[PDB]
Amino acid sequence: DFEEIPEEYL
Amino acid sequence: ADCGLRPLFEKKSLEDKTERELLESYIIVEGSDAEIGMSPWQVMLFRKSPQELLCGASLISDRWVLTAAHCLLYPPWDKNFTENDLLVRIGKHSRTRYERNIEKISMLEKIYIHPRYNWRENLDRDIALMKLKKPVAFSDYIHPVCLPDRETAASLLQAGYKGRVTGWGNLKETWTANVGKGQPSVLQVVNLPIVERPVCKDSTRIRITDNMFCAGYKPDEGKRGDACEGDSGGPFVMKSPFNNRWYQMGIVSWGEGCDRDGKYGFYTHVFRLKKWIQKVIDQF
Ligand SMILES: N=C(N)NCCCC[C@H](NC(=O)[C@@H](Cc1ccc(O)cc1)NC(=O)[C@@H]1CCN1C(=O)[C@@H](CC1CCCCC1)NC(=O)[C@H]1CC[C@@H](CNC(=N)N)CC1)C(N)=O
Numbered sequence: 001d002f003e004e005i006p007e008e009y010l
Numbered sequence: 011a012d013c014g015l016r017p018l019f020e021k022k023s024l025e026d027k028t029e030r031e032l033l034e035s036y037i038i039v040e041g042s043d044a045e046i047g048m049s050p051w052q053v054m055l056f057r058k059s060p061q062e063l064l065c066g067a068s069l070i071s072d073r074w075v076l077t078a079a080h081c082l083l084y085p086p087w088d089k090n091f092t093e094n095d096l097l098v099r100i101g102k103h104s105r106t107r108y109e110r111n112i113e114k115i116s117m118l119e120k121i122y123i124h125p126r127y128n129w130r131e132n133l134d135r136d137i138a139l140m141k142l143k144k145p146v147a148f149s150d151y152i153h154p155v156c157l158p159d160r161e162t163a164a165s166l167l168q169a170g171y172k173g174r175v176t177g178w179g180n181l182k183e184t185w186t187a188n189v190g191k192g193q194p195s196v197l198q199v200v201n202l203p204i205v206e207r208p209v210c211k212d213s214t215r216i217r218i219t220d221n222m223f224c225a226g227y228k229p230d231e232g233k234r235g236d237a238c239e240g241d242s243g244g245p246f247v248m249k250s251p252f253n254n255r256w257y258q259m260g261i262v263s264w265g266e267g268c269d270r271d272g273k274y275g276f277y278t279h280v281f282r283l284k285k286w287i288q289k290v291i292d293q294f
Contacts, residue, residue: 001188002061002106008057009097009115 014255017149018047029074029249031201035172036251038179038241039269040234041200042101046103046170049176050153051258052197054099055081055243056115057091062124064091066244066278068178068258069154071233072145078261078278079127079138086129093118101151103197105178110152116142121132126284130165134219136278138243139290155247155258162257163281166248169206173225173248173259174199177277179241183268193240200235202226205274213274214266221282222263226274235274238268246277249272 019026053067053075063080075098082091089257094117103114119141128134146152160167176199186192202225210224218224225246227233237244242265246260260277280287 001193002063003108005061005108005115009117 013154013259014250015153016047016050016256017151017153020254022120024099028199028201032174032249033251035170035203036166037197038175038177038194038200039182039236041175041198043194044103044137044197044199047151049197049245050101050151051155051177051245051256052100052102053077054102054178056097056099058095058097059283063105063178065240065241065242066179067098067140067264069110069146069152070157070246070258071146071154073142075140075142076245076258076261076287077138077140078166078263079136080124080129080133080263081243082121082138083123083127084129091121093121098140100146101149103151105194105196114145114146114152116146119143120294122294124286132217132219133264133276135221135283137261137280137283137286138245139287141294155245156255157284157287158257158259158281160281162250162252163259165252166250167223167259168205169204171248172201172203173246174201175225175237175241175246175262176246177241177244177262178201178266180238180245181193183238183270200264202235202275202282210274210276213272218276222276222278223260223279224276229271234269235249236265236269237262
């Protein structure tokens, strides 16, 4: 359901 | 110092669609779609993996985020999140989309939970602060809400006076998703009336403390609305008619069912815990 955020913050 | 004044509203002297409802009273289930920039202090506590929404929260400065303690620590549900487990998403409107160029994602530096938070019995002192690793940049969608002082709390925390609750929580108490109405596409808002302490107490068997207040409509009032799963940690605000600034009087804490007749939502009394907030911020 949740769109993929940029890996930069993961 | 510039808190409680939204870029897209107070700053340009525009009013949002329901703020007049609150002023008229001065002497999320069944809510509605929030306007853009209507709640610049709204924060989403986000779990790294599996990526999901943990709670609501609020921005009180460029480095501090306020929320409910039970959002981070709740032994009954085996909940005990640590700094790196989370992320704070600010400047959002859509629940699931990554709002490029508008939202800002922050990593947590340190969690501070109230030392006397009662998770064992009644969620007493359900409050927690989060310090961000780096300051967040204010914008049209990102701005801090103000924290109440003794006088402000005294004049606004009265039965009948309405407040505003926002969040991306469920639309209905009864388990539902994107198929039969359950999760909202965008931020939800609802204005609710503060309720008389005796009434709050008579609505439950749980022991109610002075660190909490309850809000919501009575069955006789016809109007509905309440927070729900996914909304905790979120802000309960009020617009001061004295200086036209938004103040966070409460924190979405707990209830017994969502939008139930004869029942009400309970919120953490922010002002009663301000000394603790100050100390933490001043000490760190
Ligand atoms: N994770 C789980 N295992 N279960 C999730 C249960 C969620 C219940 C739901 N809660 C929530 O959505 C959120 C946010 C909120 C705050 C105020 C408000 O007016 C509305 C929502 N907050 C919370 O999760 C906090 C931590 C425990 N919370 C509760 O609501 C408690 C209330 C008390 C718990 C003892 C210590 C003092 C506080 N109840 C619950 O989990 C129960 C929910 C359903 C039952 C009736 N349904 C049933 N099948 N038996 C009544 C109570 C709500 N409003 O009751």
